[PDB]
Write an enzyme that holds these catalytic residues in place. Sequence first.
Site, PDB file in Angstrom:
ATOM      1  N   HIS A  43      72.082  73.467 145.687  1.00 52.31           N
ATOM      2  CA  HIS A  43      73.513  73.640 145.549  1.00 52.31           C
ATOM      3  C   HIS A  43      73.863  74.072 144.136  1.00 52.31           C
ATOM      4  O   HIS A  43      73.062  73.968 143.199  1.00 52.31           O
ATOM      5  CB  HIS A  43      74.258  72.371 145.975  1.00 52.31           C
ATOM      6  CG  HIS A  43      74.291  71.289 144.942  1.00 52.31           C
ATOM      7  ND1 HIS A  43      75.417  70.533 144.699  1.00 52.31           N
ATOM      8  CD2 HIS A  43      73.344  70.838 144.086  1.00 52.31           C
ATOM      9  CE1 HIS A  43      75.155  69.654 143.749  1.00 52.31           C
ATOM     10  NE2 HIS A  43      73.901  69.817 143.364  1.00 52.31           N
ATOM     11  N   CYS A  97      75.441  70.123 137.913  1.00 46.82           N
ATOM     12  CA  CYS A  97      74.526  69.112 138.408  1.00 46.82           C
ATOM     13  C   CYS A  97      73.216  69.207 137.647  1.00 46.82           C
ATOM     14  O   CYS A  97      72.772  70.305 137.307  1.00 46.82           O
ATOM     15  CB  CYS A  97      74.278  69.314 139.904  1.00 46.82           C
ATOM     16  SG  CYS A  97      73.155  68.147 140.673  1.00 46.82           S
ATOM     17  N   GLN A 115      76.858  62.566 150.112  1.00 44.70           N
ATOM     18  CA  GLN A 115      78.286  62.477 150.404  1.00 44.70           C
ATOM     19  C   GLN A 115      78.609  63.213 151.697  1.00 44.70           C
ATOM     20  O   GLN A 115      78.055  64.279 151.989  1.00 44.70           O
ATOM     21  CB  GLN A 115      79.089  63.033 149.230  1.00 44.70           C
ATOM     22  CG  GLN A 115      78.827  62.256 147.943  1.00 44.70           C
ATOM     23  CD  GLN A 115      79.675  62.718 146.778  1.00 44.70           C
ATOM     24  OE1 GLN A 115      80.602  62.038 146.358  1.00 44.70           O
ATOM     25  NE2 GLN A 115      79.307  63.846 146.204  1.00 44.70           N
ATOM     26  N   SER A 138      82.288  64.665 143.918  1.00 44.60           N
ATOM     27  CA  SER A 138      81.676  65.163 142.688  1.00 44.60           C
ATOM     28  C   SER A 138      82.344  66.428 142.179  1.00 44.60           C
ATOM     29  O   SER A 138      82.334  66.676 140.967  1.00 44.60           O
ATOM     30  CB  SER A 138      80.178  65.439 142.868  1.00 44.60           C
ATOM     31  OG  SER A 138      79.540  64.413 143.593  1.00 44.60           O
ATOM     32  N   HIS A 141      81.127  72.449 145.838  1.00 49.41           N
ATOM     33  CA  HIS A 141      79.746  72.886 146.012  1.00 49.41           C
ATOM     34  C   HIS A 141      79.665  74.240 146.699  1.00 49.41           C
ATOM     35  O   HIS A 141      80.455  74.542 147.596  1.00 49.41           O
ATOM     36  CB  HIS A 141      78.963  71.894 146.874  1.00 49.41           C
ATOM     37  CG  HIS A 141      79.070  70.475 146.425  1.00 49.41           C
ATOM     38  ND1 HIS A 141      78.112  69.873 145.636  1.00 49.41           N
ATOM     39  CD2 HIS A 141      80.059  69.563 146.578  1.00 49.41           C
ATOM     40  CE1 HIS A 141      78.475  68.628 145.378  1.00 49.41           C
ATOM     41  NE2 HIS A 141      79.661  68.419 145.926  1.00 49.41           N
TER      42      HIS A 141
HETATM   43  N1  LIG Z   1      76.071  63.562 146.182  1.00 49.80           N
HETATM   44  C1  LIG Z   1      76.127  64.483 147.134  1.00 49.80           C
HETATM   45  O1  LIG Z   1      76.305  64.214 148.325  1.00 49.80           O
HETATM   46  C2  LIG Z   1      75.924  65.913 146.673  1.00 49.80           C
HETATM   47  C3  LIG Z   1      75.699  65.972 145.182  1.00 49.80           C
HETATM   48  C4  LIG Z   1      76.776  65.956 144.306  1.00 49.80           C
HETATM   49  C5  LIG Z   1      76.596  66.012 142.935  1.00 49.80           C
HETATM   50  C6  LIG Z   1      75.314  66.081 142.416  1.00 49.80           C
HETATM   51  O2  LIG Z   1      75.140  66.134 141.062  1.00 49.80           O
HETATM   52  C7  LIG Z   1      74.225  66.092 143.274  1.00 49.80           C
HETATM   53  C8  LIG Z   1      74.420  66.034 144.645  1.00 49.80           C
END
Ligand SMILES: NC(=O)Cc1ccc(O)cc1
Length: 147
Positions: A43, A97, A115, A138, A141
């Site tokens: 992602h 990320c 998530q 977060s 994405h």
């Molecule tokens: N947490 C999730 O469901 C997706 C995700 C969101 C932020 C990140 O830094 C890495 C993965």
Amino acid sequence: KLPPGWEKAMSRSSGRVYYFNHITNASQWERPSGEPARVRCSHLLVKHSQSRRPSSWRQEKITRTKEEALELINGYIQKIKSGEEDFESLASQFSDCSSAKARGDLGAFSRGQMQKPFEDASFALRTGEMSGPVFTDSGIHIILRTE
Ligand SMILES: NC(=O)Cc1ccc(O)cc1
């Protein structure tokens, strides 16, 4: 009809029919082709000031608005779809990320780990397919299902 999640739509600018997936936020002109225990995804995350942690390796204090984050996402998607840029290159350079250092790769995962909007999009993507903007706590994405 269509692999669930998909609906027909009409281009406002051209009047041509296209297909939209309301789980992945993907959209395409062609009629969509159509679940595994695990999937693998990369992602590209763009955080905003309401992100659960408005900080990243790119920026100690992430101050951009959700709207500004979505605009960045939309621009990355455009360049990926035109082939001007590779997903992996934009993830490495611009994902908020820590997985940026791995070209955005998160490895393989099951349901229950991620998530929920991310998970649902990941599992509704076909292998090799890319999502549209996917919203989580977060940030926003772009998701690429690699396996
Ligand atoms: N947490 C999730 O469901 C997706 C995700 C969101 C932020 C990140 O830094 C890495 C993965």
